[PDB]
């Protein structure tokens, strides 16, 4: 199955009491693996299997880089606010990551948001930056003047990020690469006369599930989001109404297994 490594950075100018001006969290797939912030000024594991497999040298070195990234991030944000002539608190976000697909293929990405809206998206193949407005297009011209920076990123996305993903996937193989199959049951009268059919799944991992209704697809399937159960499994459902005598059935696909409940 596709696996991913993602690092997020959140920066907040003029934060409230308590609210850190900087947070940086790392995820493999939907599991968090690492945390840093302007309060703890320390990089910590958010999974025991990271904690067990990376020596103190690791947390020591990356604490220091993150204290650095915190500094750089306060300045990039303070500058953007000058550029827009924005007073008061605003936010700056960065997400970087790579997918290792099953075909053995790879993807890499890096983007920034200002106030939760897309600002700069990197293209590692054309070594260029897509910008949304004037102030963004200005930051692009600077970043593209630096051939060596653009090449550093492309190499990091394509080589480093995938090497990290691979050893993280090993450190946490029992958590990240297990399958817990889903419980799939179908329970049924949505108003007097009309009947709905609910296809429900729970206790499953990984969270990627396909669920639909068919006849022997079907139009107007009400789908429910994949939600976390709190035990590290997920749950999800699909509902559907019945013209008051066609033969219907719920189809579910998870982690290589296909199910039909008539």
């Amino acid at each position, epitope marked *: 199955r596709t696996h991913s490594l993602r690092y997020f950075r959140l920066g907040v100018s003029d934060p409230i009491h308590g609210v850190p001006e900087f947070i940086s969290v790392g995820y493999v797939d939907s599991h968090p693996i690492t945390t840093y912030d302007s309060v703890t*000024r320390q990089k910590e594991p958010r999974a025991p299997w990271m904690a067990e497999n990376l020596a103190p*040298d*690791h947390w*020591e*070195r*990356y604490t*220091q*880089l993150l*204290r*650095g990234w*915190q*500094q*750089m991030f306060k300045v990039e944000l303070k500058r953007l606010q000058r550029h827009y002539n924005h007073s008061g608190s605003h936010t700056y976000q960065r997400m970087i990551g790579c997918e290792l697909l099953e075909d053995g293929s790879t993807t890499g990405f890096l983007q920034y948001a200002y106030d939760g809206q897309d600002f700069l998206i990197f293209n590692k193949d054309t070594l260029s930056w897509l910008a949304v407005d004037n102030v963004a297009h200005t930051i692009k011209q600077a970043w593209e003047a630096n051939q*060596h*920076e653009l*090449l*550093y990123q*492309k*190499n*990091w996305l394509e*080589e*480093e990020c995938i*090497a*990290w993903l691979k050893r993280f996937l090993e450190y946490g193989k029992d958590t990240l690469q297990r399958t817990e199959p889903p419980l799939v049951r179908v329970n049924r009268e949505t108003f007097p006369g009309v009947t709905a059919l609910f296809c429900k799944a729970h206790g499953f991992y990984p969270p990627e599930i396909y669920m639909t209704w068919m006849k022997n697809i079907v139009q107007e399937i009400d789908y429910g989001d994949i939600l976390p159960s709190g035990d590290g499994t997920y749950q999800a459902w699909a509902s559907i109404e019945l013209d008051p005598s066609n033969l219907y059935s719920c189809h579910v696909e998870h982690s290589g297994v296909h199910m039909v409940l008539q």
Partner: antibody
Amino acid sequence: QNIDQPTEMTATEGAIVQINCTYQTSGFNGLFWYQQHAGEAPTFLSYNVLDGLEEKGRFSSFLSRSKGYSYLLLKELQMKDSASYLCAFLDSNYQLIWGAGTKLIIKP
Amino acid sequence: AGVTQTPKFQVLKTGQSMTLQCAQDMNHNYMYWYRQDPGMGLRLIYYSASEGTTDKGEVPNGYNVSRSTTEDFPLRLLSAAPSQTSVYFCASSNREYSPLHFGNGTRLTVTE
């Protein structure tokens, strides 16, 4: 986490010298060459991180990520190219690992 | 502009204390202290990813640093030893991955 470059190299004024640099690492964030004149501060020459060649004038830098190999190529040598040439790479942790340096002697 | 390092030369008696200054006007986030010695690469003593943080390099023993400001990264020799006879270079870089700008060095000799 080792790096090798030759101690000393000597070449005739007007000719060509290729300074080799090899490096074993599990992780790479780029290779640098710095120039250091006797009694002076090392100064930035070249950054390579993808495979291939870069050229700024009489100076070229090549990198093979796979072969873990770099060369600094100096054409049309001048007496002023007498200096130490330092190679360095960033590892996975962004630690800058320095070679022992190559002293380039130019014969007039 | 660049990195200014003082002094260029110092002799110390064994056990004396010594502050090497080093400053940059370039807004660099990283500053570094290296010693250069015949037959080996530069060896990192300490470094600093930003004002308010510092960390050991490969040869921290015998040295301390401070980074109260972006500008300044002083290196203090605590108790001077013969083995510290060396040439000291402090450097700055915009980022963990950008080119180092070096100062013009300190030639330092410790005699009993």
